[PDB]
Every structure is written in structure tokens, then in C-alpha cells.
Write a protein that binds this ligand. Structure first.
Ligand SMILES: CCCCCCCCCCCCCCCCCC(=O)OC[C@H](COP(=O)([O-])OCC(O)COP(=O)([O-])OC[C@@H](COC(=O)CCCCCCCCCCCCCCCCC)OC(=O)CCCCCCCCCCCCCCCCC)OC(=O)CCCCCCCCCCCCCCCCC
Ligand SMILES: CCCCCCCCCCCCCCCCCC(=O)OC[C@H](COP(=O)(O)OCCN)OC(=O)CCCCCCCCCCCCCCCCC
Ligand SMILES: CCCCCCCCCCCCCCCCCC(=O)OC[C@H](COP(=O)(O)OCCN)OC(=O)CCCCCCCCCCCCCCCCC
Ligand SMILES: CCCCCCCCCCCCCCCCCC(=O)OC[C@H](COP(=O)(O)OCCN)OC(=O)CCCCCCCCCCCCCCCCC
Ligand code: HEC
Ligand code: HEM
Ligand code: HEM
Ligand code: HEM
Lengths: 240, 380, 101, 52, 49, 68, 60, 72, 54, 54
């Protein structure tokens, strides 16, 4: 349809000017991506070494990397072998090429969710409204098999099967894995994946604001002190 | 002994330009802006140099190299977003500088004005090719749109566009030559700005009153030096709160996808400093006429010295032409808003009225208003 | 009639140079004809013009104006550069029509 | 505002400068034809009919 | 005459330590110079940082 | 589900407002005028968008308070 | 007994070399103290969200 | 080219040292009336173009949201 | 190097530096010519050439 | 192209597929060599005729 539905603004914990991301939510959204979203979507620009100092220690991230297998080679005989993963490895693609991705998902290519927050209007609000907005189609429109009605998708007929539901996965910390909680955690994690510099950027911005609020009256006072010779200058004209 | 500042053959130029240059005492804060432009220019160059140290001009490894800059290079996100937001702030300072020149009658310096118009063309070409450079979706499709409207030229347009492209479409030859041209053009802009300052210093600078300022003149140091340091620090404040708090309020989200020739975006538009030009282009139902109107819009900005039909230089004492000037500025804002809109109701008629009023205010109504106040003040 | 004169006085107050102590003839952008007109001025009028321009620049620097009693009134605004300027334009037109023949 | 340039002396000056300007336009036309290898002109010159 | 010139009153612009015309200067010049150079020094510290 | 979704609770709380219920009878008149075999191309996309906009604005006002 | 800006000028600001020396000394003191205060404020805004607030349930 | 820019006769200028005078002498008390004086001089020339184009922007947005409606 | 040895980072930064250096060379050549033209040039005999200059 | 996997290949693409790209590349290399020839003779002339007093 020509008319479209805009996602609402949710009160995110990082929505403030100086507010940081919640790293427990990023960790929870990482395992939400791992046991659910990694079967169809790739993460070509995020490695396992990007998670250390953010959500996991080096031992936990090393165990996560050694859980999955990565093709590597070739050897001295000239063949590609199947080694365990390392910290430097990128996240494993579900499909080697987009053609088998379109074949496995019935024509539709599942996109790379590396900057899917920054590639869409609304950011993570769009992702949260897309994952928690799967509703039945209204009367007057007929939906063919293999398509699903999501009003936040452009054209309102998305090709993605509804991926999350209640207790779709189990959390390590005992959080109740409701559908909205899973969607919020994966939206926080995708926001981190699009902007990994976000916390450092906001800390640098706080330092910039404090330093420039210090510097501005001081250099204004210096400018006004040097210009007070001209600002207080008086003129007189006495022809004979 | 001697004075080393005035007798050294190298220090004499800096003494004549930035130390003992006679300047009007009553110039306002708008006179900071051009100096800020120069500072912003070198800032761009510095950031660009470091963005040249990790970027690969190749369609397989352009977007991946940009993501490698953003994620893996230490503070590479900071330098990249400083480069983009400083390009936007460079155009902000450009429009305010040109608006100062239009309002205060600084276009009577004809050689300086035409040299500045040449600088404006060069920086617009530099920013266009630089926006093509990261090879997103909007980069590829904006390059396609601009080169197609260049191909609208009869009988030489097709040959010129396939020679600019290096092929039958936008490909890696176009990307590499755009990287080379985007690299080399700011040094041409720097040399041209040196010529710009040379012509200004041999003709002198202008006060906001438009009167002869030789009665009250002050050295550049230490008044306008510290005033420009304050302006530089305010420009750094706005640039740093744009790079550190809202990195993407001016950017395009569709540029964060890899470039796909098979998929076209639902809406294709250039950046906000091209949007009024695009809205002027989109109004005329003739592609040759649209390109003609774009080039003659910037050329009637260049032609503005020859429309001065008033005995007073600045607009300080000309309120009717002041009103027409603010109508022109608001019309430019309207064209900027329309340029980011699709061709739907009621944007076509609004854009056509905006372009007609823009050309009428620049060409017709301003000399008429100048003649009207000339009669109205008993000048002739 | 008198309505046009009152409306001219309102525009003269709306122009704003009279609040800087300036006159109308000081606000002329100096071309070569105006430069020769200034060169032909007597020394007292030239000194008065230089001081008025300097005071206007000093007021515009401080973003201030004169008090309302010190504003240049519309009545005594003497047009001092008009006869010198008229003879300069007449001599230039004489040179022009000689060179066109 | 170019009404200064209406007169017999300027007309005589322009009339003197017509043939030099026409010859310079001929030089510019031949230079643009030669440096671009235009097929509309070199196919009419009898000697140069070998590259086309 | 050249003895007719008088400097106008700067009491609307003068500092708090130099308002009194009946007391000598140089007992407060170091304080004013220290204040101005402290402003300059703090600006230089911030710029250097 | 033994685990109750808080989003459903917030949604059914936000069906108790006034703009949502006015859009609800607007959608009701829409779908029984197009469900009466009128043989038209007209559907109920606009009414569904209005109701979903009101309901989702109400939900986004108070969704994240109860989520962890 | 003069004011503290008077003796500050007469001992620190009168000579340009010791002026630059105290600018450098105050610059290093200011960078240390300002980084302390800025990380303190940024820590105080964001309880329970940073990695250093939660690296004890997982570090072991 | 100081010393030969112009010719000025009988003009006396008095200036103070920057160290004998205040940096901000009556800052707010004589800064606020001057700001409102400049505002009163300039808003009737500056503001109504921006008011008019805000009206055009709001009317265009309203017509765009109305033009995508269903009926008729 | 940008690393432990010569690698891709070294090649990219050397391309950027090789691009940027000749423009600095051109500006220094302008300063070179300016410093020469302040005092004039030198003749092969080493004498004063002010008696015969063209 | 300034990437290690596509530097030598891009140079061969210049010399083999671009029209007169071999002329441009070998002109660049031999122009660098002739540039150092001119530079060495310029320096040696400055040394011989006492031009270092400037
Ligand atoms: C109403 C609010 C309060 C107004 C008020 O207190 O006015 C006092 C006072 C009134 O001015 P005034 O009565 O004419 O006397 C002051 C003089 O004019 C002399 O002061 P001035 O107005 O010439 O000030 C110099 C001017 C010099 O301007 C610049 O240096 C700016 C140059 C342009 C920068 C552009 C950056 C890019 C922008 C992109 C958009 O400074 C500014 O424009 C702002 C300086 C702010 C410094 C930091 C303050 C914290 O206002 C100011 O002095 C302006 C700054 C107020 C803060
Ligand atoms: C803009 C916000 C409002 C600025 C404002 O208040 O301007 C009023 C000011 C009046 O200045 P003036 O009349 O000279 O002095 C009065 C007493 N000193 O007037 C000014 O300061 C005018 C000087 C600035 C003019 C430019 C403002 C618009 C910027 C965009 C211009 C685009 C021009 C075209 C470029 C593309 C072609
Ligand atoms: C009266 C105050 C009441 C409130 C009291 C509070 C104080 C407020 C300030 C008081 C100021 C007192 C007077 C001192 C200021 C100087 C005089 C002044 O500004 O007067 C108002 C001015 C009169 O015009 P003036 O320029 O003086 O002279 C014209 C010749 N008659 O008039 C104007 O400039 C009016 C300009 C109107 C412009 C309307 C434009 C309509 C069309 C816009 C189209 C733009 C968009 C086009 C888009 C096309 C495509 C869609
Ligand atoms: C080779 C040409 C050698 C030659 O002909 O040398 C003789 C010539 C004599 O010239 P001259 O002494 O000036 O007297 C002319 C007549 N009275 O002398 C000359 O022509 C002098 C030539 C001076 C420049 C020679 C440069 C040779 C290359 C030097 C490279 C290394 C420079 C240093 C690098 C470190
Ligand atoms: C296989 C059943 C998938 C699972 C598991 C996930 N997604 Fe998906 N998604 C899938 C396909 C085939 C597509 C292609 C587009 C289409 O027509 O359906 C998508 C798309 C997305 C998008 C992009 C939406 C857009 O407007 O471009 C997003 C943001 C997205 N998917 C999110 C997402 C998340 C967060 C997942 C983990 C819970 C997830 N998807 C899993 C198929 C599949
Ligand atoms: C010689 C100096 C310059 C160099 C070397 C340079 C180099 C680059 C490079 C390598 C990029 C791509 C990096 C990236 O964007 O991810 C880039 C992007 C860009 N440059 Fe420059 N640049 C220079 C000067 C300028 C100038 C003067 C402007 C105009 C103000 C400009 C405007 C841009 C813009 C708009 C982009 C796109 C930013 C984006 O991705 O959104 N550049 N430049
Ligand atoms: C590309 C960036 C530009 C730079 C770096 C630049 C630089 C400068 C500088 C340093 C000054 C002197 C300071 C001042 O008075 O503002 C100046 C003045 C001027 N510039 Fe530019 N300029 C640029 C663009 C332009 C353009 C596009 C124009 C033409 C519209 C222009 C026309 C002028 C004029 C007329 C002046 C004199 C105004 C005056 O001093 O009164 N400049 N410029
Ligand atoms: C980057 C390469 C160089 C360029 C483009 C360059 C350019 C020039 C030019 C144009 C002249 C004036 C013409 C002439 O006298 O032959 C000149 C003269 C001179 N150059 Fe260089 N030069 C370069 C390298 C050098 C070097 C490396 C030296 C130092 C050994 C040097 C020292 C001189 C001297 C001493 C003169 C003046 C001697 C005379 O005029 O008699 N130049 N150079």
C-alpha cells in the first residue's frame, strides 16, 4: 500500500544524551541472535573479539568461538579443512552465497544485520515493532502462502516467518524469556552491533561538553578583555 | 638591527596578511565565517588524509573498508564522522558566507566574487564525488542520477557521460577516478583560496555599513585573531556536538547498505546541500532545460554584480530590498525542503512557484526595488 | 502632496542611517564620480564628512545608536554633494558624447 | 546600460574589427575540428578521407 | 586652546580597585594583571588538554 | 503459555482508552462494509493503521516499565 | 600581605618561561583531575549498565 | 599600508588600558535593552518570511497526509 | 608499519603519503623560487651580474 | 587499487587493458629517473658555482 505505519518511540535505556547501553541486555540479545537469528541472517562485520570487554570475558568468548566450526585452509596438500573457531574469526554465515540464501528462503534474501538499525528509519524501534507487530491481515486483502502480514514492513507483506515467541530460548541469568523481553534484548544487541563506539562516543561527548563549557566563558573573557580598548574608546571632534 | 617581521622575505607575507593587515573596526561576526571556512577546509583535508590511510577504492572492498575504519581502526569512527559532519558544516559556513556577500554588497569586488564562484563549483564537485566514495546504495544511485542528467545534453552528452563513467554504467573505474579526483580537488581549492585572499587583500575588505572604512581601521592582530579563535571554538562546539551526540541526523540511512545495481531505492535524493538545486531541477519538465536552469542558477549568483542598480552598497539602509532578501532566503529554505520530497501533490506546484520566485527575486525584483528606493530617497 | 513628504519622512526614519548621525549624502557608495565629488569638496565639509563616517563606524562597532535628540532630522539634512556630483556627471557625459562621435 | 556604445566611431571600430574576428573564428573552428576529429567535416575534405 | 581637552569620565568602565581617583595606583596593578593572566593561563591549559 | 507475556497485558490495558476504541468501531464499519461481498478493491489498511498507531503509541508510553 | 592573585602574578606570571612552566604543570594536573571527575560523572549516570559494573558475575 | 589610507584632521581619541577597566561593565543591565532594541529594529524585516514559509510547510504536510487517505 | 611488518595498512598509508607529498613539494618549490627571486640568481663567473642583465 | 590482493593485478590491468596505460606507467617511472638526473645535476651545479651562499 502507498500509506505506511511509523514505529512509535520507545523509552530505551540508551535514549538519553549521556545514557549508555545496558550490557546485560546486549549479552541476552547476543544469545537471542545465536540460537534464533543466526540460522537465516549473517553478521559479516562482527567478530568474536568484539565481544570481549563488552559482554563476555576472554574465556567465555573463546569457548563461544570454539563451539562453532569454521572452514580454513588450504593445507600443504591443497584442501580446505574444517577447524574450530577462534577469537579473530567473524561470525559464521548461514549461506555461502546470496543465491542459496534466496533458494532456502523462497526468493527473499535475508539481509545482513550488521547495520540494520542504521539502515532503517526508526532504528531499533523499527526492529522492535517488526518483531512484535505480526498481526492477522485485514479483510479486503488476500495474502498468498509464504508471506506474512507485518504492518511495519513496506508493502505490509513480509516474507519472514515470525521468529520469536514466548520461551523461544532459555536465558543464562534466569530472565523470563517473554516475547517482548526477547525483542527488546535483540534490539539492544542490534543497536550495539550497528554502533559499537556508542558508549565511548557518549563519554567523549560528556568530556567535550564539560571542557567546552569551561573554555567558552574563558575565551569570551579574553576576547572581551582585548576588545575593551575599542569598546570604551571615546571620540571628539574640535575644528577651529 | 632591523625588524624581522617586516623585512624577512617569508614573514613579510604573513605580516601583510594576518598581522598588520588594515581591517575595518566595525565588522560583525559574519566576517568570521570565511576564515572558519578555511579552517574547516584544512580540517577536512586532515581527516581525509587519515581516511585515505585505510580506504580501498574497489567495489568489492570499499564498503568493507569503510566498516573496517568504523570498527577496527582506533578512533576511526571519530575521524570518519568528523569528515562527514565537517563537510556538512563546511557547507553551512559556505551558505552563510555567500549570504553575507549578497546582503552586505560585497559582490562589487568582481574578480574576488567570480573566483569565489569558481571555489563554490569546485567544493560542490568535491563533495559530490566524496559522497559517491563510500559506495552505499544512495552513493551509487545518486551518481547514476547526476550522470544521467548530464547525459541529457544533446549530441555530446552521451559521449561525455560514457567518458566520465569509464564504461557503460557506474563501476570500479568510476569509483577509482572519483577517489583520485576527490583527493586532488581540495588542493586546487586551497590554491584558488590563496588567489581569493590575494585579490581581497589588494582590494581591501568591506564593513557592514558599506561606507569607506579608511577613517577607522585596526590591525588584524590582536583583535580579529582572538575573534576568529572564538569563532573557531564555537564551530568546533557545533561540529563536536554533531559528531558525538547525533552522528546520523544529517546522514542517509540507505547509505548503510551495500551498493546494489539490481535494487533501486524507493526514494533517491542527494544530500541537503544539493536539495535546493535538485528541487530547481525537478520543477522544469525538460531535462536539458533543468540542467540549463541549475547551471544558470549558480551563474546568476555569479552574475549578481551586474544587477546592482542602487547608489548604496550594503542593505543596511535599504529595507525594501532587505524584505526581498529575506523572501529569497526563505524561498531557498522552501526549495531545500521540497528537494527532499517526492514528486507528489502538492510539491510540484510549490517547487515550480519556488523556482519562479527565486529567479524573479534574483533577476527582476531586486534592481526594481533598488531603483524604487533611489527615487524614494530623491537620489535621482 | 504633503502625504508623500510625510511618507518619505517615515521611510527616512525607517532607513536608519540618521540614527548613526549620518546624512543621506554620506551613504553614497563611492564610485569614481563620487570620488571626484569628494575630491572637489571644501575642507570643512570634507572634515565633517570624515568625522561623521568615523562616528558611524564607531557606533556600528558597538552595535549602538545615538540618543534620539542626536538623530539627524529630516529638515536640516543638507544635501551638500549634489551640486558637485551634478557637475561631475555633466562633465563625464560631455566626455562620453565626445568619445561616441 | 550600454547606450554609451552607440555612435559612428564605435560603429567604424566594430566594422574594422569584423574581418579579424571572423578570421579568428575560422581559426577556432578549424582547431576544434582538427583536435576532435569531427566526422562532419573531415569526410568532406578530399585528402583526409582515409581514416573514416 | 590645547589646554581645553579633558579626558571624559571612565568610571562606568573602570575596575573596582581603580575607581578612587584620590588614591595612587601600583598597589592593585599586580592583582588585576594576575586575574587577567590567570584567565589566559586557564584558557591555555584547556587548549593544551 | 505458563509464562504470561506482559506485552499482551499492556495491549489489552490500552484497548481501554478512547481513540483506540473509536478506531475500533471505524475498523468495524470498514470490515462489515467490505465483508458484505461489495466486490471492491477497497480494504481496511487505513483503519488498521489508525487503530495500530493509537494502540502502539499507548503501549510505547508504558511498555518498558515492567520488562527487565 | 597582598592578595593571592598579586603574589601569583609576581611569582608565577611575571616571567614568560615560568608562566609556560606553570601552564604545563597545571595542564598535567588538570588532565589527571579532569579525567577522574569525568569518569566519575559518567560512572554515576550509568549504574548497572557498563561492563565494569557487571564483570564479577562472569569473570570468576 | 597604515599611514596613507586616509586623511583625517582634528580628531581626538581617548582609550583605556585593558587592565584598568572591567571586561563586562554592566553586562546584563545594558545588554538586554540593546538586544531588544536590535530585535525591535529587525524582526519586522526578518520574521514574517519565516512565518509564511512555516505556514507553507504545515499546509504542504497536511495536504500530503490528506492526499493518501482512502475516501473516495 | 601499522603492524609487525609491511602489510595492507602499510600499502594504503604509503599510497596516501605518496599522493600527498608532491603538492607539498610544489609549495616548497614556490618558496624556493621566492627566496631566489628576493636576491637574484648567480652567474657562472661568480661576479656581480648587475652590470649586464637581460 | 591500493590493496595487497589487487595491487600487482591493478598494475597489470593498467599496462594491459587501459588504453596507453603502459605509456603512462613507464612514463611515470622513467620520469622519476629523469627527475633524479635533473636533481643531481642541479645540486652539482649549485656546488660547483658557489650557489650555496643563498
Ligand atoms: C537574551 C539572552 C541574553 C543576552 C545578553 O546577555 O546579551 C548581552 C550582550 C549584549 O550585547 P551588546 O549589548 O551589544 O554588547 C556586547 C557587545 O556587542 C560585544 O559583544 P558581542 O555581541 O560583539 O560578542 C562578540 C561575538 C563574536 O562572535 C563570534 O565570535 C562568533 C562568530 C561566528 C561563529 C559561527 C559558528 C557557526 C554557526 C553555524 C550555524 O560573540 C558572540 O556572538 C557570542 C559569543 C559567546 C561566547 C560564549 C558565551 C558562553 O550579548 C553579547 O555580548 C552576545 C553574547 C551573549 C552570550
Ligand atoms: C538568519 C537569522 C536572522 C539573522 C538576523 O537577525 O539578521 C539581521 C541582520 C541585520 O543586520 P544589519 O541590518 O546590517 O544591521 C542592523 C544593525 N547593525 O542581517 C544580517 O545579519 C544579514 C547577514 C546574513 C545574511 C545571510 C543569512 C542567510 C543565510 C543563507 C544565504 C544563502 C544565499 C544563497 C546561497 C546559494 C546561492
Ligand atoms: C507594529 C509592531 C506591533 C507589535 C509591537 C511590538 C514591537 C515589534 C517591533 C516594532 C517595530 C517598530 C518599527 C521599527 C522597525 C523599522 C520599520 C519596520 O520594520 O516597519 C515594518 C515594515 C514596513 O516596511 P518598511 O521596510 O519600513 O518600508 C517599506 C516601504 N513602505 O513592514 C514589513 O517589513 C512587513 C513585511 C511583510 C512581508 C510579507 C510577505 C508576504 C509574502 C511572503 C512570501 C514568501 C514565500 C514565497 C514562496 C513562493 C513559493 C511557494
Ligand atoms: C659534464 C660536463 C663537464 C665539463 O664540461 O666540465 C667543464 C666545465 C667548465 O666550466 P667552467 O669551469 O665554468 O668554465 C667555462 C669556461 N670558463 O665545468 C662545468 O660544466 C661544471 C659543471 C658543474 C655541474 C656538474 C654536475 C655533475 C653531477 C654531480 C652529481 C652529484 C652532485 C652532488 C650530490 C651529493
Ligand atoms: C528464517 C526463518 C529467519 C529467521 C530465523 C530470522 N529471519 Fe529475519 N528475515 C528473514 C528473511 C527471509 C528476510 C528477508 C525480507 C523479507 O521479505 O522477509 C528477513 C528480514 C529481516 C529484517 C529486515 C526487514 C526489512 O524491512 O528489511 C530484519 C530487521 C529481520 N529480518 C530481523 C530478524 C531478527 C532480529 C531475527 C532474530 C530473532 C530474525 N530476523 C530471524 C528470515 C528470517
Ligand atoms: C584532500 C582532502 C580530502 C581527502 C583525502 C578526502 C578523502 C575522503 C575519503 C577517503 C572519503 C571516504 C571515507 C568515508 O566516507 O567512509 C571521503 C568521504 C567524503 N568526503 Fe572527503 N576528502 C577530502 C576533502 C574533502 C572535502 C574538502 C570535502 C567537502 C567539504 C569532502 C567531503 C566528503 C564527503 C561528503 C564524504 C562522504 C562522507 C560519508 O561517507 O558520508 N572531502 N573523503
Ligand atoms: C570555498 C570556501 C571559501 C573560503 C575558504 C573563503 C575564504 C575567505 C576569506 C578568508 C575571506 C576574508 C574574511 C572575510 O571577510 O570573510 C573571504 C572573503 C570574501 N569571500 Fe570568500 N571564501 C570562500 C567562499 C567564497 C565564495 C563561494 C564566495 C562568493 C560568493 C566568496 C566571496 C568572498 C567575498 C566577496 C569576500 C569579501 C567579503 C568582505 O571581506 O567584506 N567566498 N573569503
Ligand atoms: C625539488 C626539486 C627542485 C626544484 C623544482 C628546484 C627549482 C628551482 C628553480 C625553478 C630554480 C630557478 C632556476 C634556476 O636557477 O635553475 C632553482 C634555483 C636554485 N636551486 Fe633549486 N630546485 C630544486 C632542488 C634544489 C635543491 C635540492 C637545491 C639544493 C642543493 C637547490 C638549490 C637551488 C639554488 C642554490 C638555486 C639558485 C642558483 C642560481 O639561480 O644560480 N634546488 N631551483
Amino acid at each position: 500500500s502507498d500509506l505506511e505505519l511509523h514505529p512509535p518511540s520507545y523509552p530505551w535505556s540508551h535514549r538519553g544524551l549521556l545514557s549508555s547501553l545496558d550490557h546485560t541486555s546486549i549479552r541476552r540479545g547476543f544469545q537471542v541472535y545465536k540460537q534464533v537469528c543466526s540460522s537465516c541472517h549473517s553478521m559479516d562485520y562482527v567478530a568474536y573479539r568484539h565481544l570481549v570487554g563488552v559482554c563476555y570475558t576472554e574465556e567465555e568468548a573463546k569457548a563461544l568461538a570454539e563451539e562453532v566450526e569454521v572452514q580454513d585452509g588450504p593445507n600443504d596438500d591443497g584442501e580446505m579443512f574444517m577447524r574450530p573457531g577462534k577469537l579473530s574469526d567473524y561470525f559464521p554465515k548461514p549461506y555461502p552465497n546470496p543465491e542459496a540464501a534466496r533458494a532456502a528462503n523462497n526468493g527473499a534474501l535475508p539481509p545482513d544485520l550488521s547495520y540494520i538499525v542504521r539502515a532503517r528509519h526508526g532504528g531499533e524501534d523499527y526492529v522492535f515493532s517488526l518483531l512484535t507487530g505480526y498481526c492477522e491481515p485485514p479483510t479486503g486483502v488476500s495474502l498468498r502462502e509464504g508471506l506474512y502480514f507485518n504492518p511495519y514492513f513496506p508493502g505490509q507483506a513480509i516474507g519472514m516467518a515470525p521468529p520469536i515467541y514466548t520461551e523461544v530460548l532459555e536465558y543464562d541469568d534466569g530472565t523470563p524469556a517473554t516475547m517482548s523481553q526477547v525483542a527488546k534484548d535483540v534490539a539492544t544487541f542490534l543497536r550495539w552491533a550497528s554502533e559499537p563506539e556508542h558508549d565511548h562516543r557518549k563519554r567523549m561527548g560528556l568530556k567535550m561538553l564539560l571542557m567546552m563549557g569551561l573554555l567558552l566563558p574563558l575565551t569570551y573573557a579574553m576576547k572581551r578583555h582585548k576588545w575593551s580598548v575599542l569598546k570604551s574608546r571615546k571620540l571628539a571632534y574640535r575644528p577651529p | 638591527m632591523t625588524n624581522m617581521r617586516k623585512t624577512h622575505p617569508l614573514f613579510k607575507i604573513i605580516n601583510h596578511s594576518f598581522i598588520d593587515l588594515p581591517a575595518p573596526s566595525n565588522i560583525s561576526s559574519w566576517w568570521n565565517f570565511g576564515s572558519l571556512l578555511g579552517v574547516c577546509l584544512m580540517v577536512q583535508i586532515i581527516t581525509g588524509l587519515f581516511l585515505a590511510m585505510h580506504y580501498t577504492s574497489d567495489t568489492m572492498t570499499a564498503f568493507s573498508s569503510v566498516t573496517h575504519i568504523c570498527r577496527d581502526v582506533n578512533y576511526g569512527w571519530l575521524i570518519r564522522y568528523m569528515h562527514a559532519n565537517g563537510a556538512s558544516m563546511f557547507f553551512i559556513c559556505l551558505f552563510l558566507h555567500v549570504g553575507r556577500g549578497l546582503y552586505y554588497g560585497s559582490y562589487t569586488f568582481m574578480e574576488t566574487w567570480n573566483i569565489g564562484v569558481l571555489l563554490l563549483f569546485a567544493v560542490m564537485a568535491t563533495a559530490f564525488m566524496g559522497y559517491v566514495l563510500p559506495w552505499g546504495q544512495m552513493s551509487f544511485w545518486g551518481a547514476t542520477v547526476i550522470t544521467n542528467l548530464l547525459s541529457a545534453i544533446p549530441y555530446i552528452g552521451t559521449t561525455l557521460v560514457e567518458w566520465i563513467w569509464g564504461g557503460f554504467s557506474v563501476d570500479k573505474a568510476t569509483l577509482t577516478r572519483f577517489f583520485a579526483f576527490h583527493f586532488i580537488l581540495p588542493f586546487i581549492i586551497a590554491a584558488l583560496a590563496i588567489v581569493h585572499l590575494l585579490f581581497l587583500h589588494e582590494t581591501g575588505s568591506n564593513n557592514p555599513t558599506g561606507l569607506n572604512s579608511d577613517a577607522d581601521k585596526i590591525p588584524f592582530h590582536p583583535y580579529y585573531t582572538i575573534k576568529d579563535i572564538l569563532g573557531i571554538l564555537i564551530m568546533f562546539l557545533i561540529l563536536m556536538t554533531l559528531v558525538l551526540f547525533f552522528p546520523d541526523m544529517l546522514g542517509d540511512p540507505d547509505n548503510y547498505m551495500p551498493a546494489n545495481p539490481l535494487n533501486t531505492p524507493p526514494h533517491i535524493k542527494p544530500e541537503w546541500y544539493f536539495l535546493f538545486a535538485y528541487a530547481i531541477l525537478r520543477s522544469i519538465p525538460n531535462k536539458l532545460g533543468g540542467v540549463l536552469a541549475l547551471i544558470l542558477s549558480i551563474l546568476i549568483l555569479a552574475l549578481m554584480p551586474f544587477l546592482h542598480t542602487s547608489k548604496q552598497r550594503s542593505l543596511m539602509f535599504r529595507p525594501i530590498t532587505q524584505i526581498l532578501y529575506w523572501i529569497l532566503v526563505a524561498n531557498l529554505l522552501i526549495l531545500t525542503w521540497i528537494g527532499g520530497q517526492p514528486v507528489e501533490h502538492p510539491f510540484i506546484i510549490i517547487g515550480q512557484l519556488a523556482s519562479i520566485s527565486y529567479f524573479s527575486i534574483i533577476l527582476i525584483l531586486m534592481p526594481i526595488s533598488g531603483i524604487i528606493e533611489d527615487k524614494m530617497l530623491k537620489l535621482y | 502632496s504633503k502625504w508623500l513628504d510625510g511618507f518619505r519622512k517615515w521611510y527616512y526614519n525607517a532607513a536608519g542611517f540618521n540614527k548613526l548621525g549620518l546624512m543621506r549624502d554620506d551613504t553614497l557608495h563611492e564610485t569614481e564620480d563620487v570620488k571626484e565629488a569628494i575630491r572637489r569638496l571644501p575642507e570643512d565639509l570634507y572634515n565633517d564628512r570624515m568625522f561623521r563616517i568615523k562616528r558611524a563606524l564607531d557606533l556600528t562597532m558597538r552595535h549602538q545608536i545615538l540618543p534620539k535628540d542626536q538623530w539627524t532630522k529630516y529638515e536640516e539634512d543638507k544635501f551638500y554633494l549634489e551640486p558637485y556630483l551634478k557637475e561631475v556627471i555633466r562633465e563625464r557625459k560631455e566626455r562620453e558624447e565626445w568619445a561616441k562621435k | 546600460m550600454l547606450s554609451r556604445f552607440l555612435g559612428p566611431r564605435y560603429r567604424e571600430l566594430a566594422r574594422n574589427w569584423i574581418p579579424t574576428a571572423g578570421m579568428w573564428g575560422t581559426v577556432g573552428a578549424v582547431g576544434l575540428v582538427w583536435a576532435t576529429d569531427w566526422r562532419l567535416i573531415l569526410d568532406w575534405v578530399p585528402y583526409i578521407n582515409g581514416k573514416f | 586652546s590645547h589646554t581645553d581637552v579633558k579626558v571624559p569620565d571612565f568610571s562606568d568602565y573602570r575596575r573596582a580597585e581603580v575607581l578612587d581617583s584620590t588614591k595612587s595606583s601600583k598597589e592593585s596593578s599586580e592583582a588585576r594583571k594576575g586575574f587577567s593572566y590567570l584567565v589566559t593561563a586557564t584558557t591555555t591549559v584547556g587548549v593544551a588538554y | 503459555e505458563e509464562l504470561v507475556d506482559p506485552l499482551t497485558t499492556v495491549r489489552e490495558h490500552c484497548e481501554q482508552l478512547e481513540k483506540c476504541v473509536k478506531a475500533r468501531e471505524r475498523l468495524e464499519l470498514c470490515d462489515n462494509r467490505v465483508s458484505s461481498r461489495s466486490q471492491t478493491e477497497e480494504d481496511c489498511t487505513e483503519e488498521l493503521f489508525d487503530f495500530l498507531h493509537a494502540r502502539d503509541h499507548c503501549v510505547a508510553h508504558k511498555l518498558f516499565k515492567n520488562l527487565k | 600581605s597582598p592578595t593571592i592573585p598579586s603574589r601569583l602574578y609576581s611569582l608565577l606570571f611575571r616571567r614568560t618561561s615560568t608562566f609556560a612552566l606553570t601552564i604545563a604543570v597545571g595542564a598535567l594536573f588538570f588532565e589527571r583531575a579532569f579525567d577522574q571527575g569525568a569518569d566519575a560523572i559518567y560512572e554515576h549516570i550509568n549504574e548497572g549498565k557498563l561492563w565494569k559494573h557487571i564483570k564479577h558475575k562472569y569473570e570468576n | 599600508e597604515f599611514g596613507n589610507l586616509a586623511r583625517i584632521r582634528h580628531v581626538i581619541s581617548y582609550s583605556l588600558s585593558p587592565f584598568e577597566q572591567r571586561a563586562f561593565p554592566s553586562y546584563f543591565s545594558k545588554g538586554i535593552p540593546n538586544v531588544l532594541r536590535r530585535t525591535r529594529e529587525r524582526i519586522l524585516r526578518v520574521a514574517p518570511p519565516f512565518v509564511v514559509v512555516y505556514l507553507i510547510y504545515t499546509w504542504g504536510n497536511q495536504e500530503f497526509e490528506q492526499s493518501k487517505r482512502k475516501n473516495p
